[PDB]
Design a protein around this ligand. Structure first.
Ligand code: HEM
Length: 110
């Protein structure tokens, strides 16, 4: 199966490399990027992001709900447009399908 866990790991590396300040909103704030896999808060978050991708692909994803929850953290359209770029890089690096369509679904509610 597509190794979405590996894609998500690469996604967060790209996201926080380009926008380190985004990391301050998570429970793993301040942790060196190269050590995230050893951080408990990160393990949980990465698992949820993987779950969301599989839900988007599987058809059960609540894009409206995820958008609203991100708005609830002052994360909106600009951040998700930036995320689209990082996730595209991460997917391509693993020979996985691009997930732009899934991000666009979220963006449609932002
Ligand atoms: C591909 C883009 C993204 C996906 C698929 C995604 C997915 C998710 C998911 C599934 C959750 C858990 C929601 C829940 O528990 O109900 C979450 C939480 C969160 N997301 Fe994202 N996200 C994305 C982009 C971003 C970006 C760019 C930021 C920038 C700050 C961000 C900030 C957060 C924060 C702060 C939380 C809450 C974490 C916590 O509870 O400690 N997300 N995201």
């Amino acid at each position: 199966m597509v190794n979405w866990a590996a894609v998500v790991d690469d996604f967060y590396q790209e996201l926080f490399k380009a926008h380190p300040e985004y990391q301050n909103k998570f429970g793993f704030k301040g942790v060196a990027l190269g050590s995230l896999k050893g951080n408990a808060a990160y393990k949980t978050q990465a698992g949820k992001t993987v779950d969301y991708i599989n839900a988007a692909i599987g058809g059960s994803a609540d894009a409206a709900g995820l958008a609203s929850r991100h708005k609830g953290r002052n994360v909106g359209s600009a951040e998700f447009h930036n995320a689209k770029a990082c996730l595209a890089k991460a997917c391509s690096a693993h020979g996985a399908p691009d997930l732009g369509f899934a991000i666009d679904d979220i963006l449609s509610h932002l």
